[PDB]
């Protein structure tokens, strides 16, 4: 289906304890392929997915130089933003950056995005048009002016709908065996009595790829959207994903309820029901 | 590939 390339950057000031902590990670869909950590011994952009290792020394030299440049930019920005908000030098603060692009099945551009944060709150973000910025407060409006003058938007759009899309297609092709595969979910159901006249039915999906899945409960073939505990889709650690949905049911009326599973890997949506 | 047109805040 639709694919994405995303880069995530966290910068955390450690006042009195030297340089700020810098963590950069690259994602194709929900798979990490590159990493930089300031506290790591390498001081290199490191491969984290098998299919990126066929990139030559030029790629690794370039991404190391460019990720270091982003680190240095974050180091300056932390000091600047500390000034804007008139905050003490003793206080530890966080800058978070995410940018990326989405492509369809054909591999053509769908959309691009960039968002910046300070202390886990919206600072400034590129708009859907990829030509203007939304500033959270007066401090971010100063950044917007400096980004408008430097033509950050025009150069970012050129990346998001050009470079970003091109390198995503290359990654997707090189990592074809893992990135463009579809594993359907192995499904089962568990039963947990809370008390008398009551019980929890939990609908499981394991070993599926990609992460995109829909678990919904029904009563007499009618969707029970409201009273449903839907846990966060989690990684298995082997490259697959896990999820469950749960509903509280009065004991005796287990047969009334069904769990629906929609996923790409399936040839037909599954419909589970509790069995002794 | 990383974005490289880095402007300070």
């Amino acid at each position: 289906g639709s694919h994405s390339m995303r880069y995530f950057f966290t910068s955390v000031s450690r006042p009195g304890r030297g340089e700020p902590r810098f963590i950069a990670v690259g994602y194709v869909d929900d798979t990490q392929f590159v990493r930089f950590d300031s506290d790591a011994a390498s001081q290199r952009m490191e491969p984290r997915a098998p299919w990126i290792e066929q990139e030559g020394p030029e790629y690794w030299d370039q991404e190391t130089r460019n990720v270091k440049a982003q680190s240095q930019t974050d180091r300056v920005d932390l000091g600047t933003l500390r000034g804007y908000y008139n905050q003490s030098e003793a206080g530890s603060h966080t800058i978070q950056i995410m940018y990326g692009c989405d492509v369809g099945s054909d591999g053509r551009f769908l959309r691009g995005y960039r968002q910046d944060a300070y202390d886990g709150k919206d600072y400034i973000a590129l708009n859907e048009d990829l030509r203007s910025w939304t500033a959270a407060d007066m401090a971010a409006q100063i950044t917007k002016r400096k980004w408008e003058a430097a033509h950050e938007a025009e150069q970012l759009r050129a990346y998001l709908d050009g470079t970003c899309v091109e390198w995503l297609r290359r990654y997707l092709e090189n990592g074809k065996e893992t990135l463009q595969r579809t594993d359907p979910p192995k499904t089962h159901m568990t039963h947990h009595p809370i008390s008398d006249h009551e019980a929890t039915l939990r609908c499981w999906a394991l070993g599926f790829y990609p992460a995109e899945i829909t678990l919904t409960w029904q009563r007499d073939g009618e969707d029970q959207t409201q009273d449903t505990e839907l846990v966060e889709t989690r990684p298995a650690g082997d490259g697959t994903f896990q999820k469950w949905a749960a509903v509280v049911v009065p004991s005796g009326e287990e047969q009334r309820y069904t769990c629906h599973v929609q996923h790409e890997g399936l040839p037909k949506p599954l419909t589970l029901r509790w069995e002794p | 590939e990383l974005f490289s047109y880095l402007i300070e805040k």
Epitope: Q62, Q70, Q72, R75, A150, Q155 | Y5, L6
Partner: T-cell receptor, first 114, second 111 residues
């Protein structure tokens, strides 16, 4: 005014130590050290993106730098060698992008002798 | 990595005649391109600064073009005169490598 570079020239024995001074009062976060052999272009030795950090350039070997303050960025030669005979240029900028270009010093002509 | 080249490294031109100085760079992802003048023993003098968005810059008898496609820049000197005689350096700035200089072209404008 701008970037001030001392000294203008120096004749130094093979192995002797020297500290090239570079100052700017424009409050620039970014400061750079280049060297230029005869008939060649400038080659980045070391740079600093602010007070308290330095990072190696293209030809950092045989050179040491510090950045205690925003103002100063001195370049130190631990042990002078024949290959370190060159013209040294210091630079500064407000941003990495430097949309007005870099502010450059006059230059320091270094001669290493046996 | 960013490799800036200037061929030829030397150019002899008679007074009054127009001339071209060549600059090629390998990384077309750039902030700006810069042309410097260097007199023997002296420092650098900034002639023109072309932004990545801009296509050309003009300052009197000096014109400079930018082509990120091929990764080339040309400096056009109109009605050349002995005063124009100097070493001309091509510099390219980007995040990864910062301001990176070519070898330079020693221009001789003969009377």
């Amino acid at each position: 005014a701008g970037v001030t570079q001392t000294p203008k020239f120096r004749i130094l024995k093979i192995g002797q130590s020297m500290t090239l001074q570079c100052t700017q009062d424009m409050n620039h976060n970014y400061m750079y050290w280049y060297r230029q052999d005869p008939g060649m272009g400038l080659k980045l030795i070391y740079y600093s993106v602010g007070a308290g950090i330095t990072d190696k350039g293209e030809v950092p070997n045989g050179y040491n730098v510090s950045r205690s303050t925003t103002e100063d960025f001195p370049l130190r030669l631990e042990s002078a060698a024949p290959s370190q005979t060159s013209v040294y240029f210091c630079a500064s900028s407000e941003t990495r992008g430097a949309p007005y270009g870099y502010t450059f010093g006059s230059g320091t002509r270094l001669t290493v002798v046996e | 990595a960013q490799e800036v080249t200037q061929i030829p490294a030397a150019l002899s031109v008679p007074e009054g005649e127009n001339l071209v100085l060549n600059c090629s760079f390998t990384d077309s992802a750039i902030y700006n391109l810069q042309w410097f003048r260097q007199d023997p023993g002296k420092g650098l003098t900034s002639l023109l600064l072309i932004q990545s968005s801009q296509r050309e810059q003009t300052s009197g008898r000096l014109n400079a073009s930018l082509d990120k496609s091929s990764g080339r820049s040309t400096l056009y000197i109109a009605a050349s005169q002995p005063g124009d005689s100097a070493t001309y350096l091509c510099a390219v700035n980007n995040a990864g490598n910062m301001l990176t200089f070519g070898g330079g072209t020693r221009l001789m404008v003969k009377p």
